[PDB]
Design an enzyme around this catalytic site. Structure first.
Site, PDB file in Angstrom:
ATOM      1  N   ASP D  65       0.770  -1.298  -0.081  1.00 52.55           N
ATOM      2  CA  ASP D  65       0.044  -0.104   0.138  1.00 52.55           C
ATOM      3  C   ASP D  65       0.810   1.101  -0.261  1.00 52.55           C
ATOM      4  O   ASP D  65       1.742   1.241   0.782  1.00 52.55           O
ATOM      5  CB  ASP D  65      -0.852  -0.091   1.225  1.00 52.55           C
ATOM      6  CG  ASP D  65      -1.785   1.030   1.095  1.00 52.55           C
ATOM      7  OD1 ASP D  65      -2.233   1.582   0.200  1.00 52.55           O
ATOM      8  OD2 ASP D  65      -2.514   1.378   2.123  1.00 52.55           O
ATOM      9  N   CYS D  97      -8.084  -2.270  -7.210  1.00 56.38           N
ATOM     10  CA  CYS D  97      -7.680  -2.278  -5.460  1.00 56.38           C
ATOM     11  C   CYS D  97      -8.936  -2.139  -4.772  1.00 56.38           C
ATOM     12  O   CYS D  97      -9.926  -1.873  -5.362  1.00 56.38           O
ATOM     13  CB  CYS D  97      -6.693  -1.126  -5.463  1.00 56.38           C
ATOM     14  SG  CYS D  97      -6.126  -1.211  -3.408  1.00 56.38           S
ATOM     15  N   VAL D  98      -8.578  -2.424  -3.527  1.00 61.81           N
ATOM     16  CA  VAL D  98      -9.520  -2.040  -2.557  1.00 61.81           C
ATOM     17  C   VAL D  98      -9.493  -0.752  -2.285  1.00 61.81           C
ATOM     18  O   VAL D  98     -10.678  -0.075  -2.157  1.00 61.81           O
ATOM     19  CB  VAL D  98      -9.491  -2.887  -1.232  1.00 61.81           C
ATOM     20  CG1 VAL D  98     -10.380  -2.603  -0.079  1.00 61.81           C
ATOM     21  CG2 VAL D  98      -9.696  -4.326  -1.754  1.00 61.81           C
ATOM     22  N   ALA D  99      -8.320  -0.190  -1.953  1.00 68.40           N
ATOM     23  CA  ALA D  99      -8.159   1.471  -1.538  1.00 68.40           C
ATOM     24  C   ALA D  99      -8.253   2.115  -2.424  1.00 68.40           C
ATOM     25  O   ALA D  99      -9.260   3.218  -2.332  1.00 68.40           O
ATOM     26  CB  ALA D  99      -6.778   1.377  -0.836  1.00 68.40           C
ATOM     27  N   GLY D 100      -7.488   2.160  -3.506  1.00 72.20           N
ATOM     28  CA  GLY D 100      -7.683   3.031  -4.724  1.00 72.20           C
ATOM     29  C   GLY D 100      -6.706   4.268  -4.848  1.00 72.20           C
ATOM     30  O   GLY D 100      -6.384   4.776  -4.132  1.00 72.20           O
TER      31      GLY D 100
END
EC number: 3.1.3.48
Lengths: 150, 150, 150, 150
Positions: D65, D97-100
């Site tokens: 991340d 992604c999950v986060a972005g």
């Protein structure tokens, strides 16, 4: 929407027409403004008994919609004003119609004019409180009217 | 462009009246005071998307109250509570304004009070009867704002 | 005075942002997506006086929908319908805007769409992880209008 | 909020992270943009079976991340781009992604830079579509990166 008018020793209340269900609040308003007497210048739509029991007498003196009062009505009205205000000074006289803005204000105006208030000053004094009172006929009637200074 | 439109509307608040921007009576969304609040009536009221609805009895021109939809909060549809009853539980002031009232005065009145709504009326001087207040329609804060932002 | 205030606000629509006039997240009125609509929950929603309420799941910052109170129209309290279910039945677009967006742009977007509401977010560049959109609060058409008419 | 990027013969789709319940609509979007392959650069939160049955292969290549991809990841990614776009031209590669905003755009950007697009032009091209992509480390990484013109 009750309207109070005060001049010299005279006090008038031009009010709406209540129903039998609204009578108690109505009487509350009358007692608030100190109303001794009611004059109904239109059809009588409500029982006066509860109003009588509360010490408020109701006179029924109808005259024509959009029309001036007759001479007899005028005389009775002036005499009434005199006696009632001499009997219990500071009290208030209630005048109401069903329709509104023509007849009751005509009565009150007559009282004011006899109280010495000028015609234009009277009409203006009334219309300041309720806009649109006095149709054409009633206007010209208050104009032509000759005050006896009673 | 937007800024200029807003500025112009601001300057036009002085000349324009409430009669210009009002919703005419016949086009107003209203509900009769004889309405019973059951599942269907309450559902219809909710689905209408109106936060406040005028309540009339007899003629549409005779507007006796304001129903706020939030007033329906804890009402139970099974009880079939008359609207007449529910309007008593809450005090929502019903304002009246004359048709020649300017928009800036109206905006001022809307700003001071909690009322976003007013009934538009005119003085009806057509004889030969007593003059009377005629209900033209309804004006809202939204109407004035929409007049400003074009 | 009022006209000058409106004109000034109009000129300030260009410099001001949505972050200035927004309601911060913690002060926003919201409802969880896990809500069951029963007599009490629906009554509370109605009594709140809000036409549209944001729906979050988990964190308040995670806003998954918009509940319009009119969406509750034919819902039966006895069914205890999950809010999750009801939000599916209606399409209410959920708009997002960045915190540095000017008020005139926002007003334009509000004007074109049927949406009176937008979620304010900022770019969060604090490392060392991937940048992400942080929800600051909510801005409404009402907020902008109130910024204009002071 | 899926994002499409087109340069030369290359097409990429930077998408969100779906759930197992939303898989069908997700696959609908992929098929809409013509997505052959998915690269998950973060944790794998959803079953790929239904996605595989629909003819879309899912690669799991997580890296840190807020961090650049490792050399091995870069090589595998460039080789993947080459083979996939030569195998079925006009198709699309999905990266999510999950986060972005950090990692997936870093991959896409690398692909663009190897496609001959300048660094600044690449970053600007990406940020035009999604504001706030590329934290500091990733920015400096795309700066220092030496394209092999692959």
């Amino acid at each position: 929407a009750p309207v109070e008018v005060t001049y010299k020793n005279m006090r008038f209340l031009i009010t709406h027409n209540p129903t039998n269900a609204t009578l108690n609040k109505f009487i509350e308003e009358l007692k608030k403004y100190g109303v001794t007497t009611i004059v109904r210048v239109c059809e009588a739509t409500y029982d006066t008994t509860l109003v009588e029991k509360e010490g408020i007498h109701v006179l029924d003196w109808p005259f024509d919609d959009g029309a001036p009062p007759s001479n007899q009505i005028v005389d009775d009205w002036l005499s009434l004003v005199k006696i009632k205000f001499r009997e219990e000074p500071g009290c208030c006289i209630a005048v109401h119609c069903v329709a509104g803005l023509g007849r009751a204000p005509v009565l009150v105006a007559l009282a004011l004019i006899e109280g010495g208030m000028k015609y234009e000053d009277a009409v203006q004094f009334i219309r300041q409180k309720r806009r649109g009172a006095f149709n054409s006929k009633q206007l010209l009637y208050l104009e032509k009217y000759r005050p006896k200074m009673r | 462009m937007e800024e200029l439109n807003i500025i112009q509307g601001a300057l036009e608040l002085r000349t324009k009246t409430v009669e210009d921007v009002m919703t005419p009576l016949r086009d107003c969304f209203m509900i009769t005071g004889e309405a019973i609040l059951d599942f269907n009536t309450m559902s219809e009221i909710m689905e209408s998307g109106y936060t406040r609805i005028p309540v009339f009895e007899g003629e549409r021109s005779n507007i006796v109250d304001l129903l706020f939809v939030k007033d329906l909060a804890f009402v139970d549809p099974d009880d079939c509570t008359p609207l007449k009853t529910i309007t008593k539980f809450y005090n929502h002031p019903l304002h009246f304004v004359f048709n020649d009232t300017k928009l800036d005065a109206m905006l001022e009145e809307f700003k001071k009070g909690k009322s976003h709504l007013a009934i538009v009326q005119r003085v009806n001087n057509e004889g030969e009867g007593d003059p009377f207040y005629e209900v033209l329609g309804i004006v809202t804060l939204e109407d004035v704002i929409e007049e400003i932002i074009k």
